[PDB]
Every structure is written in structure tokens, then in C-alpha cells.
Design a protein around this ligand. Sequence first.
Ligand SMILES: OC[C@H]1O[C@H](OC[C@H]2O[C@H](O[C@]3(CO)O[C@H](CO)[C@@H](O)[C@@H]3O)[C@H](O)[C@@H](O)[C@@H]2O)[C@H](O)[C@@H](O)[C@H]1O
Ligand SMILES: [Cl-]
Ligand SMILES: [Cl-]
Ligand SMILES: [Mg+2]
Ligand SMILES: [Mg+2]
Ligand SMILES: [Mg+2]
Ligand SMILES: [Mg+2]
Ligand SMILES: [Mg+2]
Ligand SMILES: [Mg+2]
Ligand SMILES: [Mg+2]
Length: 377
Amino acid sequence: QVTLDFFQFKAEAADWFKQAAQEFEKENPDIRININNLRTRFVKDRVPDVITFNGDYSFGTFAASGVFHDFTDDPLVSELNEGMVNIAKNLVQTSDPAKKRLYGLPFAGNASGYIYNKDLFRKVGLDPDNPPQTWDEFIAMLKKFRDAGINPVQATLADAWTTQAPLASLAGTLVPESEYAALKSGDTTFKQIWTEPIEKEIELFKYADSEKGVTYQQGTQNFAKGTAAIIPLGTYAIPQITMVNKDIDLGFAQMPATNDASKQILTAGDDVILTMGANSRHKEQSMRFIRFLMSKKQLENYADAQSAITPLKETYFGNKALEPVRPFFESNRVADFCDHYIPSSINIGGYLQSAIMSGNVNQFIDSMQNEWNKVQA
Ligand SMILES: OC[C@H]1O[C@H](OC[C@H]2O[C@H](O[C@]3(CO)O[C@H](CO)[C@@H](O)[C@@H]3O)[C@H](O)[C@@H](O)[C@@H]2O)[C@H](O)[C@@H](O)[C@H]1O
Ligand SMILES: [Cl-]
Ligand SMILES: [Cl-]
Ligand SMILES: [Mg+2]
Ligand SMILES: [Mg+2]
Ligand SMILES: [Mg+2]
Ligand SMILES: [Mg+2]
Ligand SMILES: [Mg+2]
Ligand SMILES: [Mg+2]
Ligand SMILES: [Mg+2]
């Protein structure tokens, strides 16, 4: 009989993981799973046995420091979407190509863009199956909502991380990931690469016609209750909206950053990486649970509950709301999040909140650059 500590990062999926653990326990009487919904928590001697983490810079730093088990050879890997596996490997924060190993399993994918209310689209005569293809059309849509008496955009600025979503959506098209290597070597600057994304994010939030400084929970509640045409968050937010209102008719769309309709890109990443503490005392039992979670049945059950994208080679989309972005995935017109290249020590969320509210692009760009420069030094 062993007790596993399961650190589960994702607020929106707390019940799903609680129930999955309980199901596993019923079938495996020799294993109890204690869920806790960060370096201190991840000291070797107390590292959780099973872990979910967002696939971001922080994951990559813990991976490079040896906190997580090395899954590179694991028999599970060959049934997974190679792009999602490669994203996880490329997050490892190392300058040595050979050290870009696999330190967790992609469990679920996301995309960043905007969630929209199809009934409000219908109300103003827009086609909810064919959202805007260009920046100009996207802005014209927001203006159409305002002119019809509808709040175009629900902001959630009181939760700073939410301001990263539009930046990442827009940067996906505007800024190739290769620019971050040039940024590190000093061959480009934030002024050159992020001025246009931040200007467009500021423009987007000029169409937030209600109070901007509300919380994530408040914004998703407002949206669920029909009071805004769009909420510019990624797919991870869908379950939070639908739990408030089962009946809301939602779509998810790419946020078009330019007027080149043929060269739009969808920001998409590894929303959940499932891993094991490298210094776990109970690796065999931990892996039994991980194998249970990584079965197609469980992955698809999760994807349905959470409106996510499964990590299997045959991709499954958990919600018909995701139909407008299916072509980006099919054509591989995707990009990882721009903020996965930004060290966790830089307070990008706080700088973005300030930029959106104040409009002061120069201060935002200078803050990012000066903090980046010091890290690279
Ligand atoms: O654009 C926002 C964000 O999207 C991706 O992360 C999705 C992740 O965001 C939220 O999780 C928290 C909420 O505090 O935010 C960090 C990630 O920034 C997570 O550690 C934390 O749990 C949602 O609540 C989650 O459901 C969702 O999975 C992207 O990877 C991030 O870099 C960032 O751009
Ligand atoms: Cl594949
Ligand atoms: Cl599907
Ligand atoms: Mg423990
Ligand atoms: Mg919740
Ligand atoms: Mg490489
Ligand atoms: Mg046009
Ligand atoms: Mg009005
Ligand atoms: Mg690219
Ligand atoms: Mg106003």
C-alpha cells in the first residue's frame, strides 16, 4: 500500500482529475492518490510523484534542472502527436542540443485566439461558422457589435496572466519563433518584434466597453451570461464558461493579426504535460497511474470535458466549438506561445496589464528589453 502525491496545476480541471484518480483507486487497491490542486514544493526530498504542469518556460527550467523523470524512450511516446512531443522537448531550457530530451508526456493541447457567442453573431447577421479572416475584418466585427449595442470584448485584466493570451495569439502570426534566437543573440530587439503585437492588443481592448479590471472568473461569468460578443482567451477557458451556462452556443476562432488572409497562424501549445518526479520513491505505481491517464479513453474523456485537443497521432477535438480552427491544425499552420521564450523572472503579465491600461508602448518595450538584457548577461 502506497500513497502518491499528485500535484495538479490546472484549476479548471480539478474535478476531472479528482474523479479520474478515484476511478484508478477503485481498480488499484494498492495505490492511494492524494491530490494537491513552486521550487519549494519541488525540492527532491518532497517532490510530488505525479505532476501536471503547463507546457511553458517554467516547465522547461524544471526539466533542465532534473526535477522530472526522463520519458524519452518510454513506450507511450510513439502513439503521440510528434509535434506536441517536439514542443515539450524544445521547451527544455538548455543551450545543448543533446539535452532537449522529453521530461513529460503531452496530455492535452490548447489554442489561443478568441471565444465568441454564436447567438450574438447571428443577432448582428454574422456567420458564426466563418469568423473574420483578417485584422481589418476582425476590427470591423468589433465595431459592428458596439454599433448594435453589444459589448464587443470582455477583458479580465485583474488576472494578469489573461493579458498574455491576445499577445500570444497575435504574435503567432506576426513573429516567427526564430526571432527569439535572434533576440537572445542581440540581432533583434523587442522594439522590432513586439511593437506591432502590443499596438494591436491595445487596439483590441479599446473595444472592451465594460470595466476592464475584472477577474478571470468574473469575465467568464459575464460572457456565459451573454453580455459580450467575444472573450479573447484560449481553449482552456471554454469549460469555465460552460460550467456557468450549459446552453451558451460558443465558437472558437483564430485572432487574425494581419490583412494577409493566406498567411494566418494559430498559436497552439501543450496545455498539460503529465510527468513524474525524478526522485519519486514510488515510480512503478506512479507510472501505472500515468499509463491509465494516457489511454485513448481517458484522453478523449478529458478532451470532451475540457474542450481540449488530444495528444494522440489521430487528433481528437473535444468540442465542436473548435471547428473554425481545425484547418490550422490540419495544415500545420501553428506556432508555440511567444511567452514560452520569456524567462519566468520577467513580469510580462504585470507589464502587459500596464500597457493595456495606459497605452504606453514605449514603457512596455523598454521594460521587456531591459529585463531581458540583464537575464542574458
Ligand atoms: O495566454 C495565456 C497562457 O496560455 C497558456 O497557458 C494556459 C494555462 O493558463 C492558465 O494557467 C495559469 C493560471 O494562473 O497560468 C499559467 C500559465 O501562464 C499556469 O501555470 C497557471 O495555471 C489557465 O488557468 C490554464 O487552464 C491554462 O492551461 C500558455 O502556455 C501560457 O504561457 C500563457 O500564454
Ligand atoms: Cl504525428
Ligand atoms: Cl475530432
Ligand atoms: Mg510526497
Ligand atoms: Mg473553476
Ligand atoms: Mg534545435
Ligand atoms: Mg480587407
Ligand atoms: Mg452603445
Ligand atoms: Mg513558425
Ligand atoms: Mg468606451
